[PDB]
Symmetry: D2
Subunit: 391 residues, 4 copies
């Protein structure tokens, strides 16, 4: 019934007014018919009543409703992009003197926010290995306020054992807020909230929008954390425009058919790479032998199309250019989760720099791929040709 | 030549590509043709080269260029709304242990951000009377990092003596960052940067957009503060979508003809109110006898259409409803700076609550008006009828 | 009450705004019916503002249609993809093989081409008349004349019709003719066409209504007599405009008053300056005494927009033309007008003579058409002055 | 290479994207010319993809036009405000008084009305033929037959033409006829019309290309022979579509492959289930054996979309109809289709007979047209099953 949910989520007549999709209500000013009306709207300003553009319009309400039902939360807070969702969700719960524990495989910008912004506000941050599991207790402090997860990890794709981590945290620091950047799973392939996680964050910019033409971040919360996140993010003036909210709801409608193709094509490519002479290792959660594959197998209900692989040799600058500059279908660009295929290379030294309190375990050049909606055989042919360029 | 500047600001062929207005480039992913291309874009990521959607696209660049030339700054940082611009600009420069000095007539949400968010991060905030001038030195501390101004003040409209305040601050704490919420002047009726102010903030949501259908905040900085504000706001993931950037640039084109009508109509209404039997006081910067009128006369080059007046009596709930609920042209709504006229009432007790370390000097109900683009005589007739309702 | 108040409020009812200041944008082809009863009700009111199908429109279109009827005083408003579509389809809606169309020879070129290239092959004939013919238009009327098409001021040359004289003359001879007017220059508000006995007022909303040169749309406001026929025949031709463009047009109306006033003020100042210039032969501005039809404009219009033209004393050659046009700093060369920026275009006498059917032009020098935008007028005059220097 | 790869890359050249993944949105009427030389160059290439005027298009439109020509293999692509406009204007572009139009009697109703209500008054006659006439179409040809209009599968009843037989028969008799097809059901990619000798392939992009029921647009992809005439005559009629809609249509193409595959898979499963149901008289699905023209579909198409119909054994009365239609939880009643959601509409035999000119219908029970969206198929079957229970 997921497909059925995706097609219907948030589409009440109150929002569509007769149309299939919700209407787009662009507004800062929202008019009150009377003093009585104004008083009522005021009282329900954080409860879906038209009050002020910063709180949202019918278009935003429709998206919030859809996200809460898809991820099973009490509320949904909207942001300008995924990076704003991460930074502001963390900021909403911290206080001078707190400690933040974050996975060392977290998205680089998330790490930078902690080391460059939080540090000057009297908050300390330490990091942990993605596969630590129950041993995370060794990193917990009396003042640990937030435990930040990201599974699979950025670039390297390690999958956490969430159940083990959550149980350990609750036993030591019950009051801690556990958050996860659930972008890779598009919030649906891993129901973070069903695992005891408090806040599920997404760079909707990725798979939810699915066409690389809009930026937006979402944070779906359980009942315990909703109010504080909502009100604090509001004091920071966080919101997203009505048109982007519309575009995101629209992207949900094809999320099912898209994820299924991404899953099928990426796995086929992964298995092919796994048997290629020039490849040292394939980092795909759905592929046996990948770090944390056992957990992906147990906790996820599917896979998206982003993964990486390690070459047997470390390419030099000339080789890198020759390899990358001549692809016919894969394009070099940041971001992912769109309809087209992308390729990016990372030298071992680059990764080591962004793995705080951790160590890298490979020496060849790492290639990150996003498998789009093109014919998988055309993509394999392109990759095959690329290897020949560096043979 | 202001009118000429408004029509041409930011419209280089690089952004328009043959059209009158800049193109709308919606994007998260921006493609690099080669490794050499990627390296170059990386190097100029904060210098107008296409790199990643969060940094901006051609559409954002065009708006940033227009704002810098209109306000005379070194750079322009974009935000989701005016409240985000205020909160994030302050956050970009503070550190645990700092002190923030803010006018007590500041926009309520700005005050709340300081008292509810900054307080928990070890930053203290104290407030000052708008008309203090050179005596502000009595409030300066060794750790005063930011001095926040808003002229005219929200609701009550007091105008600061900016030159006196800036000279005093520089003489005592040279390193302080002086900011001003320059929304009422739409950034053009008061050239904040020419007065020694470091950052000029605007809720572009107001007069720049001018049609009440988009939300966006802007911060134009001098050379001294640009880099820190730009990079720190970036770590917080602040940005605005491409379509809203387009809409804001579009609003600039009619800013001149709009402000001129708002100025003419609001003054006529103000002078009429000033002579009405039921009115105790009129708070319009351009009207003699208004608090700080001497400074408006000296430092501003015009007026917009927002102002307030105080009735001789304090209306009770029944009277309030009867007065407000029966207007034919004025509508009750938050926000302003649009093409239509708006009305809001505030009881003396309500204002006193939002005037920290200050005291109110009126006892009648205060009415805030935004004079739109309707025929001024029709608006006066509507007001006249309203008074008769409470006689 | 007054025009400015009407522009700010037209079409903005709660049913369309739903609490916001502007109408909501309802993008749709499919419109859902809750029950068979609802579908029945919708079908019966499909042309009366009830949600039925995207081609008929959504709340966004209904809001604009209401705003337009209010502003121009019509019974109904039909929407098209652009002004040219409004012209071609409005004419087509009323003709049959064997009919005759009488059009002013100063009509917008594309409108003329529609008649001579398309209508001609469907058995419809077109003849032309001089803009200042007045009551003498009776001489061009035929028993099969179905449509009399006006355009005042005329395209490029700006001649103003004596509409009252024309309408009365046509009605005395062919009572049931359909009189239409391309009322784009007046933006539908500076000349109230329907108050003068005209049946259909057409506008390229693309110009002043949108006012920012970033959207295309055509409108046709009809009286009670012609509404149903135009609406239904345009519908069979699949004519419609997208929801977002309807929203942007409604939005343009809000500043139409303040914009037109500035366009009026600035263009007249530029016209008067040009009138006293040594290199200028004549200025064609409706508001300027001596201009063709000036007394009619003075009598029938309530204002002026910013488009006009002037004739140079000399006919520039290719080299002079490039040197003049290529070096302007504020004025740009482009088609269309009615936006916030100033534009300039040049036409040689021979170009104009070719598009003035059954008529003679009255000038020999190069004609320059100017659109005066919202820039500072003194900066504009300076740019023009520098232009004259490149020609002396 | 393969279809999926083409859909992802079609029209996405750097000239249109400028570094982004999708084409930029260039909203405009006015397009600025830097010099007289530039204006000259633009004028000469105004119909060859050079920026000239908004009515001709901007970079956004050019990108879509290129994508469409690539996908359908044509020389050019003409854009319209909606599918109905594409049909009406494409026919109008090629006719003159005295011509004859031969159209399938299963044509979309609005297309039929255009011919009988508009064309008739311009001296053009229209006759009709049965969808399965095949090579016998020669019997309906006249010396003045200018256009043969096909639609396969037919609207509502879904009959599939034997196109190869029809085209060859027409060409043997009237070599220079213009053969057109409303190729909306196949989304232009499931049946390559131009490869079969058809001159113009028309689509209501409003359906599957947009795929989300929130934009309206019509496209006409022509062969080299008919391109200039269709392009120029549609231009004189002021036909165009806005930049934002062009962008949204290009965007729709990217997921067309994954969407159509799901629509194909789900509708066939629903069709087979319906085929074995006690209350179902017959299922009209092109992919189902026994359906009219099934062997032609099997032979000429490369897939199926999600729209089809079925006939109930009984003809429901008003009470039964409401009880059946009003109580569906997943299927909604609405016009249009090709979106992500499932729709349902009912038609009585007498309704259909009225829109089947010079033909006889072959059923007596109530006909239900279904659009199978992207919802879980088992949930859809359950909703339908509950529907049958309200009728037993």
């Amino acid at each position: 019934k997921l497909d059925t949910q995706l097609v219907n989520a948030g589409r009440s007549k109150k929002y569509t007014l007769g149309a299939v999709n919700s209407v787009i209500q662009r507004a800062s000013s929202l008019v009150f018919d009377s003093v009585e009306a104004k008083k009522h709207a005021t009282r329900n300003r954080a409860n879906g009543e038209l009050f002020y553009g910063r709180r949202g319009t019918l278009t935003h309400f429709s998206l919030q409703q859809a996200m809460c039902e898809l991820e099973g939360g009490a509320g949904c807070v909207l942001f300008p992009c995924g990076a704003a969702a991460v930074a502001n969700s963390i900021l909403a719960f911290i206080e001078q003197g707190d400690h933040v524990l974050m996975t060392n495989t977290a998205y680089e910008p998330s790490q930078d926010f902690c080391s460059k912004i939080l540090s000057k506000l009297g908050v300390t941050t330490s990091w942990f290995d993605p596969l630590i599991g129950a041993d995370i207790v060794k990193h917990l402090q009396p003042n640990t306020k937030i435990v930040f997860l990201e599974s699979p990890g950025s670039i390297t794709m390690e999958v956490h054992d969430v159940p083990a981590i959550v149980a350990a945290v609750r036993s030591v620091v019950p009051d801690a807020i556990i958050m996860i950047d659930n972008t890779w799973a598009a919030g649906v392939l891993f129901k973070a909230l069903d695992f005891g996680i408090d806040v599920s964050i997404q760079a909707a910019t990725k798979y939810l929008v699915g066409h690389s033409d809009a930026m937006i971040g979402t944070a779906v919360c359980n009942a315990r954390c909703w109010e504080q996140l909502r009100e604090n993010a509001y004091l920071m003036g966080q919101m997203v425009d009505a048109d982007t909210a519309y575009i995101t709801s629209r992207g949900l409608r094809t999320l099912g058919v898209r994820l299924r193709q991404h899953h099928e094509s990426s796995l086929k490519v992964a298995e092919w790479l796994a048997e290629h002479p020039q490849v040292a290792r394939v980092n795909h959660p759905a592929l046996p032998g990948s770090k944390g594959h056992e957990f992906w197998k147990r906790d996820f209900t599917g896979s998206s199309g982003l993964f990486s692989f390690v070459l047997k040799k470390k390419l030099n600058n000339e080789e890198l250019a020759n390899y990358l500059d001549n692809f016919s279908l894969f394009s070099m660009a940041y971001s992912w989760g769109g309809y087209e295929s992308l390729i990016l290379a990372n030298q071992p030294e680059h990764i080591a720099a962004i793995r705080p309190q951790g160590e890298i375990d490979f020496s060849g050049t790492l290639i990150r791929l996003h498998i789009g909606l093109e014919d998988v055989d055309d993509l394999i042919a392109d990759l095959d040709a690329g290897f020949a360029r560096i043979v």
